Amino acid sequence: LSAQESWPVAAAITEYINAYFRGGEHNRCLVKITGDLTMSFPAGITRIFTANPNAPVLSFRLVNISRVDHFLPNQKLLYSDPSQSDPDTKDFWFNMQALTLHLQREAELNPQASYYNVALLKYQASSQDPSRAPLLLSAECQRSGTVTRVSLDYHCCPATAPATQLTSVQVLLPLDHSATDLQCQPPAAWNAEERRLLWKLANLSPTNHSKGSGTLCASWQCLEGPAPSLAVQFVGSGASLSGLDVELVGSRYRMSLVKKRFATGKYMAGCS
């Protein structure tokens, strides 16, 4: 009976974002998003595939891909149409013989697993438009004598951000152990291993102004390089930053789930 029922697969879209806000007059920014598409298969689908080399063709589509600059499909397992010019959509077909062998090896390698993951695609998106960055940063710096002051405004914006919260939000300002007369609003911790100031921020949401925007600052004295840079860290789930999405083509398979997650890489605000 297993032969005739529609078979489930699952997809995962993972994206990392690097950003730099220069500061100064125009506070120009650069954004780079790097993404990965993985597909998962239930362990029992091997026995179906090994037993039937004629198994029907698993086919899928990428959608809302206008924002993606470059694709690297897995050429071991996938086919495509180079004659497909559609800018917002692209189709891929599995090689079912290679896919079968690939899962057989995965099973042979890990007989205990209940599912097996397969890497379909790598991709990249770059922009100088801050509208691609979910969290807008503006840092400023001033120095009078031995006193340095640093401030950061952050803005989580509905025009920029996907619809979801940014969580595990941290702001990192590196500061040497020779600094004295520390003032921070709001309060921050100083991590001695990494030598940096740490702010932990509440989750941020584009939905509400008070929930989404804020400011913070610190000052110190140094008896004695370039202006300091602040690093921001956060995480999200339920949306992609690029806008890319995946859907199956045909009814023979069905998508059990699509997991979407993103995280900051190096995500920075500099000040002049």
């Binding site: 078979w7 489930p8 995962a12 239930p42 993951n117 059990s256 997991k259 997650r261």
Partner: peptide
């Protein structure tokens, strides 16, 4: 953010398949 995006949590656990 480990390399297994399903983080050891079977996405098919509740699926009617099989």
């Amino acid at each position: 953010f480990q390399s297994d995006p399903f983080v050891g949590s079977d996405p098919f656990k509740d699926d009617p398949f099989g």
